[PDB]
Structure formats: C-alpha cells, structure tokens
Amino acid sequence: LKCNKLIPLAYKTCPAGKNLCYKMFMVSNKTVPVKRGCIDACPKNSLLVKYVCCNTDRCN
C-alpha cells in the first residue's frame, strides 16, 4: 500500500509493518490535513487531533 505525502503529488510506500494509511488533522482546520503517513494499526481519534485511517491507495 502507498500513501500520499504532505504535498499532493509525492508518495511513499508503507514500511515494514505499516500497511495502512493515516492522516493527522488539527481542530485548527479539520478540513485540511496537518500530517500524512502510513500506520500499522488504525489509530484513535481525538478532540484536538482527528486521525483518519484508510486501506486505499493514495487515500490520504
């Protein structure tokens, strides 16, 4: 699986153990991402930072 980078054009494969994609959003703008990468296990969402996982290509 591959996930997009911070800038919508670059991407990187999810490392050993990481076969899931995730995105870190901040209350400041839940409509725009703060961080993007891959993850091993789908994380827990927060009130301040919202985490969204996906099992698709260039999902995030």
Side-chain angles (χ1 to χ4, degrees), residues 1-2 7 10 12-14 19-20 23 25 27 29 31 34 41 52:
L1 206 92
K2 297 164 219 173
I7 306 259
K12 220 135 293 273
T13 295
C14 310
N19 76 340
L20 272 150
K23 65 183 71 192
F25 278 43
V27 90
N29 196 314
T31 292
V34 93
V52 167

Side-chain angles (χ1 to χ4, degrees), residues 38-57:
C38 299
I39 211 163
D40 172 70
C42 187
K44 60 128 248 173
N45 66 76
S46 329
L47 49 124
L48 190 121
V49 58
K50 205 260 215 97
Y51 297 89
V52 167
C53 73
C54 30
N55 59 313
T56 30
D57 89 303

Side-chain angles (χ1 to χ4, degrees), residues 4-22:
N4 211 299
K5 299 253 291 193
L6 211 180
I7 306 259
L9 91 165
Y11 60 100
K12 220 135 293 273
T13 295
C14 310
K18 279 188 219 290
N19 76 340
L20 272 150
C21 291
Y22 90 75

